[PDB]
């Protein structure tokens, strides 16, 4: 299993240790500063959280900060590693918690594993942080725990999955009664292993308005029910049926309706779910292994409503589904604790989104959302844009009806329109081209197919099943480097190898090239030479006659070296006259893209007027919403430079041709990525928030602008330099495009292939 | 160029940071033919005629001039060490817009900005947006370079 | 044909540049009677003994001129006239005699970027002789100077 083992021991501590780094968020690049964070003046915020604790929330942390705090007695799905020793997975989850909802989480680890001390060290913890997420309390002491801890602090105590995926839980239900038209009223259950976020659920899921005589609590020894046992189990008395003689699941059925169970192996079978009333809801949340063999049941019934915890279907239950978003109504409103209804309101917001999901600007291309609410559709996939905008304001709506929190939101436009700017920073647009790419894989050329990164991606490509690689190369050397480098991928079982020297097709591609370039300074000797030493005229030809689909080449030697071979062999796009490289970069304010970094030197008007549609047009293809700015050192006609007024002229140019474009310039970069600026200058400008995409006057200024910011402000790589403007899908890299960078790469050429790559 | 490179340099001598400039341009050691990396190429040999003591290469890209792994990898013989402090760019353009970028996302506090180097007597020239620290700031500056021969 | 009427006529030492496989069938095929060693040297462009001194010189010469070093080595590898240009530099061979395969320029701007330019000349050209009526004539520059000006 090293292809996962390996990979994920490959962690990425190697710059510096942890995945959090407690850094300051403010300046502290002057004495003024360090006087300001450590000198008097950090004795006035202090003493003022002193005169009034109301100002605990405001002047520091403890405002976004949660603290998972635990004894790391169950690590996610670990167990009892330890406080200090359950790091890794702590810190695992507490990065899916500032990545997704930006919400600060101090991995204090709690060495006190007793049950009644654990409570003690974490309530002398408690002002520390704003709302606990305790998590790694284990069974039965997480249920024990808890309850004690509940009622000491007056700050959010919120502990993980027991009180967690009930909401989520809770949401399916509601959904699934509505799928089937059915009541709350007459559903009777099954529920099997009580675990720790088994036997805490349906107490959720009765506050909706549930009988408690419709529930059968089940563990591993058979059937908890009032009679079987002469003690009578506590929390699960109160749903036991009378005894009946049933002492096998295989029985307990008696068409019942729902399946909530939160455990290990499977239970349920298939004669179990026949023996269902009609409509069954199987709701088996086994991680490792389905209860129930997903497709199996639905091969015995249809109309099957399964929900499991696994991403790989639709209907996931992550703790990213509210976890993060549940905080961020809960520390966001200033809660003194989550009662039920806290509990209960974000039921009833996740549940409406998966009835209630539309727009939000779908990936045009790419992507193949194609979610429709139904029998497979019951909650929102795991991420989502407002999934945090919809859960996070029903918490905080929960806290205002339960009147237990301390600073009540005001009018819930603002809110929402906060929410809404967070929610523009903070996209993953590859997992979408990712998913599309491997439903369909394509053929890829990889003329340089002997580089070390291009193996390494050849192989991360065979095993995300992404693209069918076609390697250009010498299969000896391609072989002994596969061998050095410690790669499993073969020739011919994983991918396909070109070999540049007695290739059985040499004839008819020195031809075509020729026929191609006759006229253009190539001669029938110079195209039978090109076609031998030249990969990319190889690749070129290859996809050009049909033999494969997209080519991703550029890891070695210059751009323009490769790019004249592309546009050469494939030309320019149908009402296309120009050619642009679009550079991806993660800032601040969101993802942002940089036109035309690699390709034209000095683009005039119409050539970035063409280059702002392509550039406009593939963001829109990624489900990011184009906002363009042209960039120029005048700000709105300060300067009369021919660069500005060319920047002026592709502005009306573009306006022209795409009325619907928000776009807006010249301007400057700080004016374009800051709306307070621009709306200082410009009150009236048509670009709203912040602009994703950078339009530059010249190659030099983009490149440089790119190259700076990436190693300066940058966090990670998606894209780039994508090529728009060329017929065919083809992506010239550069030699320093790392493994990670060849990847995505060719999964975008992937699923730009799928759509008539032509 | 050369000259507003020997300024520069200066400038950020009296700092108490040693200079380390780069001269940036879309091309990296040669790799472009435009008039515009050529004139990179000539104002670092006029550089070099004129102060032989500078830390100064180029051109280079913007990552090669920051990151001292990838100038490695393309100049292992670089005479820059490190990261370059002073970074010197072929237009106007492209080094405002790169300002104006960086200051918005990849940047902590204000020091200094922009400050006017070549004229006979201290003066500052600031912009309509700059924030009350920087006019103490450049205001400071400007002191403390008044109080070496105004002229 | 070339190289066997060089060895013939005793005017040359060739050292010949290129696969020693294809080379060999290419002269059993044309019926020529030189062999690889006895009359003419084989330089093999890959797996040749001297690669890791080629590329570095040539990187060395070219570092600052828009080559890097995987750019070098993938010119000592699949460019023969840069090839033959380290090998005269730095000593092995005496002479060259490219240009039979593609343009001009791209082997004179190798043979430049190596060579240089010969000392107190700053200009380069290329003359092609006639046997006229009129008797042996030389036409100055028919393929390096596009545009010569009057000092050029
Ligand atoms: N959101 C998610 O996807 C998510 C979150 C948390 C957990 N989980 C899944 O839930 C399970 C454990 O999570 P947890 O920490 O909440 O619970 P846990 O504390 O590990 O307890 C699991 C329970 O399952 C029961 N069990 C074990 N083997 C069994 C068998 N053969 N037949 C019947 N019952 C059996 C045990 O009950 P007895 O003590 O009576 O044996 C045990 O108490 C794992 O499968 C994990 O992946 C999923
Ligand atoms: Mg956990």
Redesign the interface.
């Known amino acids: 299993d090293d292809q996962l083992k390996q990979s994920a021991l490959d962690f990425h501590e190697f710059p510096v240790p942890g995945k959090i780094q407690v850094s300051p968020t403010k300046?502290?690049?002057?004495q003024?500063?360090l006087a300001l964070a450590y000198s008097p003046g950090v004795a006035a915020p202090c003493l003022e959280i002193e005169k009034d604790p109301l100002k605990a929330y405001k002047y520091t942390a403890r405002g976004n900060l949660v603290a998972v705090i635990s004894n790391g007695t169950a690590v996610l799905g670990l167990g009892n590693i330890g406080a200090l020793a359950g790091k890794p997975v702590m810190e695992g989850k507490g990065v899916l918690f500032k990545k997704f909802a930006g919400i600060d989480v101090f991995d204090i680890e709690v060495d006190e594993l007793d049950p009644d001390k654990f409570i003690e060290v974490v309530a002398a913890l408690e002002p520390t942080f704003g709302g606990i997420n305790l998590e790694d309390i284990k069974a039965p002491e997480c249920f024990y725990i808890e309850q004690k801890l509940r009622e000491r602090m007056n700050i959010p105590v919120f502990h993980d999955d027991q009180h967690g995926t009930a909401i989520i839980s809770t949401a399916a239900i509601l959904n699934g009664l509505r799928v089937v038209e059915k009541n709350i009223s007459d559903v009777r259950m099954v529920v099997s292993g009580a675990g720790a976020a088994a036997i805490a659920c349906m107490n959720l899921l009765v506050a909706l308005g549930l009988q408690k005589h419709n529930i059968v609590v089940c563990d591993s020894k058979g059937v908890i029910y009032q009679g079987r046992e002469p003690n009578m189990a506590e929390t699960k008395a109160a749903y036991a049926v009378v005894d009946d003689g049933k002492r096998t699941l295989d029985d307990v059925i008696e068409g019942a309706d729902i399946f909530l169970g939160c455990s290990g192996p499977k239970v349920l079978t298939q004669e179990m779910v026949k023996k269902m009333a009609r409509a069954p809801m199987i709701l088996a949340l086994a991680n490792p292994e389905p209860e129930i063999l997903p497709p199996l049941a639905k091969e015995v019934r249809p109309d099957a409503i399964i929900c499991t915890g696994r991403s790989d279907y639709p209907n996931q239950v992550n703790n990213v589904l509210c976890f993060p978003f549940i905080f961020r109504g809960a520390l966001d409103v200033g809660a003194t604790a989550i009662n039920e209804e806290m509990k209960l309101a974000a039921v009833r917001a996740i549940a409406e989104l998966a009835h209630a999901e539309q727009s939000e600007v779908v990936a045009s291309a790419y992507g193949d959302q194609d979610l429709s609410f139904g029998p497979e559709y019951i909650i929102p996939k795991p991420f989502d844009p407002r999934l945090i905008v919809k859960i996070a304001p029903a918490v905080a709506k929960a806290a205002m009806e339960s009147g237990v929190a301390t600073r009540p939101i005001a009018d819930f436009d603002v809110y929402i329109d906060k929410l809404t700017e967070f929610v523009y920073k903070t996209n993953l647009f590859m997992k979408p081209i990712f998913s599309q790419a491997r439903k369909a894989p394509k053929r890829v050329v990889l003329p340089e197919g002997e580089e070390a990164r291009v193996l390494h991606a050849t192989q991360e490509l065979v095993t995300l099943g992404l693209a069918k690689p076609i390697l250009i190369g010498r299969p000896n050397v391609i072989e002994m480097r596969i061998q050095k480098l410690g790669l499993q991928i073969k020739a011919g079982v994983d991918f396909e190898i070109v070999n540049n020297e007695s290739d059985p097709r040499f004839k008819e591609y020195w031809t075509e090239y020729f026929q191609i370039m006759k006229r253009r300074?190539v001669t029938q000797?110079?195209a039978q030479?090109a076609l031998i030493?030249n990969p990319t005229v190889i690749g070129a030809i290859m996809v050009q006659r049909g033999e494969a689909d997209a080519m991703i080449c550029g890891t070695?030697?210059?751009y323009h070296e490769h790019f004249s071979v592309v546009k050469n062999v494939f030309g320019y796009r149908d009402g296309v006259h120009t050619a642009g490289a679009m550079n991806a970069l993660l800032?601040?304010?969101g993802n942002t893209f940089i036109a035309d970094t690699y390709v034209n030197?000095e683009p005039d008007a119409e050539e970035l007027a063409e280059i702002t549609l392509m550039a406009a047009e593939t963001v829109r293809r990624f489900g990011i919403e184009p906002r363009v700015a042209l960039?120029?050192?005048s700000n709105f006609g300060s300067s009369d430079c021919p660069?500005s007024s060319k920047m002026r002229q592709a502005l009306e140019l573009v306006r022209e041709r795409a009325p619907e474009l928000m776009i807006d310039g010249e301007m400057?970069?700080?004016?374009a990525?800051?709306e307070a600026?621009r709306n200082?200058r410009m009150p009236d400008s048509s670009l709203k928030g912040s602009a994703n995409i950078?339009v530059?006057?010249?190659?030099?200024?983009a490149?440089?602008?790119?190259?700076?910011?990436?190693?300066?402000?940058?966090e990670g790589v998606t894209v780039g330099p994508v090529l728009m403007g060329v017929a065919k899908p083809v992506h010239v890299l550069t030699?320093?495009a790392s493994v990670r960078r060849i990847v995505n790469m060719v999964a975008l050429a992937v699923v730009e292939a799928q759509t008539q790559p032509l």
Do not use: K
Request: net charge negative; proline share 8%; charged share 20%.
């Open positions: 300046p502290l690049a002057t003024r500063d300074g000797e110079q030479r030493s070695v030697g210059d800032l601040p304010s030197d960039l120029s050192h660069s400057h970069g700080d004016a990525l800051v600026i200082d950078l530059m006057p010249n190659m030099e200024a490149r440089i602008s790119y190259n700076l910011l990436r190693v300066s402000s940058s030699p320093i």
